[PDB]
Scaffold this active site. Structure first.
Site, PDB file in Angstrom:
ATOM      1  CG  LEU A 267      -6.926   1.631  16.630  1.00 13.03           C
ATOM      2  CD1 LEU A 267      -8.364   1.853  17.104  1.00 13.03           C
ATOM      3  CD2 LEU A 267      -6.675   0.157  16.400  1.00 13.03           C
TER       4      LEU A 267
ATOM      5  CB  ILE B 207      -7.534   0.812   6.520  1.00  7.94           C
ATOM      6  CG1 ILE B 207      -8.005   2.168   5.991  1.00  7.94           C
ATOM      7  CG2 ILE B 207      -7.987  -0.337   5.631  1.00  7.94           C
ATOM      8  CD1 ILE B 207      -7.624   2.438   4.553  1.00  7.94           C
TER       9      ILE B 207
ATOM     10  N   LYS C 170      -5.983  -2.730  14.325  1.00  5.73           N
ATOM     11  CA  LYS C 170      -4.945  -2.357  15.261  1.00  5.73           C
ATOM     12  C   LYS C 170      -3.573  -2.850  14.841  1.00  5.73           C
ATOM     13  CB  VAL C 171      -0.486  -1.244  13.946  1.00  6.63           C
ATOM     14  CG1 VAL C 171       1.001  -1.516  13.996  1.00  6.63           C
ATOM     15  CG2 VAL C 171      -0.965  -1.141  12.526  1.00  6.63           C
TER      16      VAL C 171
ATOM     17  CE  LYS D 173      -1.092  -1.879   7.476  1.00 12.79           C
ATOM     18  NZ  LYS D 173      -0.688  -0.637   8.134  1.00 12.79           N
TER      19      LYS D 173
ATOM     20  CD  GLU E  79      12.311   1.022  10.233  1.00 15.11           C
ATOM     21  OE1 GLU E  79      12.419   0.823   9.030  1.00 15.11           O
ATOM     22  OE2 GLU E  79      13.077   1.749  10.858  1.00 15.11           O
ATOM     23  CB  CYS E  80       8.799  -0.575  16.272  1.00 18.02           C
ATOM     24  SG  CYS E  80       7.848   0.393  17.445  1.00 18.02           S
ATOM     25  CG  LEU E  81       8.839   3.872  11.795  1.00 21.24           C
ATOM     26  CD1 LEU E  81       8.148   4.459  10.578  1.00 21.24           C
ATOM     27  CD2 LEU E  81      10.322   4.159  11.769  1.00 21.24           C
TER      28      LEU E  81
ATOM     29  CG  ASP F  65      -2.849   6.882   1.683  1.00 21.67           C
ATOM     30  OD1 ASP F  65      -3.698   7.779   1.512  1.00 21.67           O
ATOM     31  OD2 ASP F  65      -2.860   6.128   2.679  1.00 21.67           O
TER      32      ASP F  65
HETATM   33  N1  LIG Z   1       5.785   0.646  11.871  1.00 17.15           N
HETATM   34  C1  LIG Z   1       5.079   1.366  12.747  1.00 17.15           C
HETATM   35  N2  LIG Z   1       5.690   1.870  13.865  1.00 17.15           N
HETATM   36  C2  LIG Z   1       5.012   2.609  14.770  1.00 17.15           C
HETATM   37  N3  LIG Z   1       3.697   2.828  14.576  1.00 17.15           N
HETATM   38  C3  LIG Z   1       3.034   2.364  13.483  1.00 17.15           C
HETATM   39  C4  LIG Z   1       3.732   1.606  12.520  1.00 17.15           C
HETATM   40  N4  LIG Z   1       2.878   1.282  11.585  1.00 17.15           N
HETATM   41  C5  LIG Z   1       1.691   1.748  11.921  1.00 17.15           C
HETATM   42  N5  LIG Z   1       1.792   2.448  13.067  1.00 17.15           N
HETATM   43  C6  LIG Z   1       0.640   3.119  13.747  1.00 17.15           C
HETATM   44  O1  LIG Z   1      -0.565   2.474  13.262  1.00 17.15           O
HETATM   45  C7  LIG Z   1      -1.367   3.373  12.490  1.00 17.15           C
HETATM   46  C8  LIG Z   1      -1.780   2.593  11.206  1.00 17.15           C
HETATM   47  O2  LIG Z   1      -0.804   2.979  10.236  1.00 17.15           O
HETATM   48  P1  LIG Z   1      -0.788   2.698   8.676  1.00 17.15           P
HETATM   49  O3  LIG Z   1       0.498   2.139   8.260  1.00 17.15           O
HETATM   50  O4  LIG Z   1      -1.010   3.972   7.996  1.00 17.15           O
HETATM   51  O5  LIG Z   1      -1.943   1.677   8.342  1.00 17.15           O
HETATM   52  P2  LIG Z   1      -3.463   1.864   7.967  1.00 17.15           P
HETATM   53  O6  LIG Z   1      -3.503   3.303   7.251  1.00 17.15           O
HETATM   54  O7  LIG Z   1      -3.877   0.799   7.018  1.00 17.15           O
HETATM   55  O8  LIG Z   1      -4.284   1.844   9.204  1.00 17.15           O
HETATM   56  C9  LIG Z   1      -0.444   4.572  12.215  1.00 17.15           C
HETATM   57  O9  LIG Z   1      -1.169   5.810  12.111  1.00 17.15           O
HETATM   58  C10 LIG Z   1       0.516   4.596  13.392  1.00 17.15           C
HETATM   59  O10 LIG Z   1       0.102   5.472  14.454  1.00 17.15           O
END
Ligand SMILES: Nc1ncnc2c1ncn2[C@@H]1O[C@H](COP(=O)(O)OP(=O)(O)O)[C@@H](O)[C@H]1O
Length: 277
Positions: free
Chosen positions: A27, A29, A32-33, A48, A94-96, A135
């Protein structure tokens, strides 16, 4: 003639090319991702969702223009679909999975170095193309896999920003005034490097002050086995005045960073401390 493709905002429903699930990779800003799957290849990907608006399309572009960099999470493709009568911007990444930088750690000086080195690269590239992440916090540093060779990648461009508008002998200043200085990026680095080596951040929790005052220490025992060289590097990163602070180019060349292989496998209390508070 080396050339990559330009970004293309796909208009067809992402559902046709992808298979969106309820699983939540995390989760933040924008919300949900979600984890998604590519039908024709069946690989996992992060999704996203942004409201489509000028600022958003800027972010996306910046990130897409920086995905060619190994240590930056890559954008596979972006969609402009209609969500809730609302025009949205769907970004596939890509999914980390390896997890956040510190987690993996808690769960050798030489390793800390190597980590710093890749984060460095993520920054060197961005800057080499006139972009400031602004950031670069641990949270935005995820590992590709849980595997031992997983690779570290920087993500999140919600604050990414272009620093450049609009004679071999001319100075960089004259080239023009480019603000939004990436210096903070170099600061974030210090903080990170610090934390790695001991397990806790330099500025603890009148904290906003200790920072402005730029007052911290390398408390013993923790730092009793750490080089003054390594210590000196944190100091030039943790310079309170931007213009005084080290540059990404100067960082990638500092020995500790440029020659990880030849850096002491001296153990660090990190994980322990890292787990203690
Ligand atoms: N590409 C990704 N692969 C795996 N997890 C991700 C990925 N992108 C985001 N996440 C998960 O979603 C959360 C949101 O990440 P972020 O990119 O920092 O967006 P935001 O800061 O706008 O919420 C991350 O803290 C992470 O746990």
């Amino acid at each position: 003639f080396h050339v990559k493709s330009g970004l293309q905002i796909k208009k067809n429903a992402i559902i046709d090319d992808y298979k969106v699930t309820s699983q939540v990779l995390g989760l933040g800003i924008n919300g949900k991702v979600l984890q998604i799957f590519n039908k024709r290849t069946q690989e996992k990907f992060a999704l996203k969702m942004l409201q489509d608006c000028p600022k958003a399309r800027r972010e996306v572009e910046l990130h897409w223009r920086a995905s060619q960099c190994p240590h930056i999470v890559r954008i596979v493709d972006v969609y402009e679909n209609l969500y809730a009568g609302r025009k949205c911007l769907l970004i596939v990444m890509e999914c980390l999975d390896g997890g956040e930088l510190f987690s993996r750690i808690q769960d050798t000086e030489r390793e800390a170095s190597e980590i710093m080195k890749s984060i460095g690269e993520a920054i060197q590239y961005l800057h080499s193309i006139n972009i400031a992440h602004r950031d670069v916090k641990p949270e935005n540093l995820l590992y590709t896999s849980k595997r031992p060779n997983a690779i570290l990648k920087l993500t999140d461009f919600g604050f990414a920003k272009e620093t450049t508008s609009h004679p071999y002998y001319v100075a960089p200043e004259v080239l023009g005034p480019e603000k939004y200085d990436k210096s903070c990026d170099m600061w974030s680095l210090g903080v990170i490097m610090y934390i790695l080596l001991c397990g806790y951040p330099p500025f603890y929790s009148g904290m906003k002050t200790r920072i402005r005052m730029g007052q911290y220490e390398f408390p013993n025992p923790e730092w009793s086995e750490v080089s003054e060289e390594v210590k000196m590097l944190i100091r030039n990163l943790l310079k309170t005045e931007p213009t005084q602070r080290m540059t990404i180019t100067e960082f990638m060349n500092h020995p500790w960073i440029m020659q990880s292989t030849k850096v002491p496998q001296t153990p660090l209390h990190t994980s322990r401390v890292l787990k203690e508070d």
